[PDB]
Amino acid sequence: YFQGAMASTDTVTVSSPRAGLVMEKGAKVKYRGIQVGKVTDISYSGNQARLKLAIDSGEMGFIPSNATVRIAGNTIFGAKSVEFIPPKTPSPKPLSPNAHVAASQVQLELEHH
Amino acid sequence: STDTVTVSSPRAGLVMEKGAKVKYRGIQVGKVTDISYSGNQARLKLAIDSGEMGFIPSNATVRIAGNTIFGAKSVEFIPPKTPSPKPLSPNAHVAASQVQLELEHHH
């Protein structure tokens, strides 16, 4: 390898115990209250998700090699598709070019496996 | 050319693969382009073909199939029982067994 210009960071990977995890935009990495990096990439392969972190070079000298990872978050609805359903009594006027579908007209269903 | 249709979500915690397909009676009519989260409400921004909205009635409902997944927000390294003197090595990998998924509190 060759020495970088400045602001060098080291990459570290994290395996997700639950597949299908998603990461929020601009997620940070902390250690004892201090931000030490950020989450750059996230790849799905089969039934496992891996996270790629970017910790500062100087900050990784303080994290023990036997430390654990704690990921906070909430359960959300991960949707894959959107489908319009023909109503029981359809309207003559088609969908207008600038239409809005109210939330009461939306049906959230769980997929089958 | 495409036209934009917006859709409100019954759940604020809704994510979607970018460029997910929008279908009507088996055939694809467009794709979702963006999701706006103003406040605690989610609004989908669809983009469907111009010649496809003539077949979709104005009073058509929307079905969205998906799964309940974990929406991570932050990653934190936790000091162990007894920290080892050797620091984290570059390109190290922490296995899924050493990962703890916790739900955050809400007031």
Author numbering:
A (entry chain B): 32 to 144
B (entry chain A): 39 to 145
Paper text:
The mammalian cell entry genes (mceA–mceF) encode the substrate-binding proteins of the lipid-transporting Mce complexes in mycobacteria. In terms of lipid transport in Mtb, Mce proteins are characterized as ABC transporters. It is now well demonstrated that Mce1 is involved in the transport of mycolic acid/fatty acids and Mce4 imports cholesterol. A common feature of each of these proteins is that they all contain a conserved domain of approximately 100 residues, now referred to as the MCE domain, which is characterized by a seven-stranded β-barrel fold, although the sequence identity of these domains is very low.
Despite extensive trials, only MtMce4A39–140 crystallized readily in several conditions in space group P65. Although Matthews coefficient calculations suggest the presence of 6–8 molecules in the asymmetric unit, assuming a solvent content of about 50%, the solved structure showed that only four molecules are present in the asymmetric unit, corresponding to a solvent content of about 71%. The structure was refined at 2.9 Å resolution. The domain-swapped dimer is formed by the extension of residues 107–141 from one molecule into the other molecule. The swapped region contains two β-strands and an extended loop [Fig. 3(a)]. The residues from 107 to 141 are exchanged between the two monomers to complete the signature MCE fold. In comparison to the homologs from E. coli (EcMlaD, EcPqiB and EcLetB) and A. baumannii MlaD (AbMlaD), the overall MCE fold with a seven-stranded β-barrel is conserved in the domain-swapped dimer of MtMce4A39–140. The dimer appears to be selectively crystallized, for example favored by better crystal contacts, compared with the monomer.
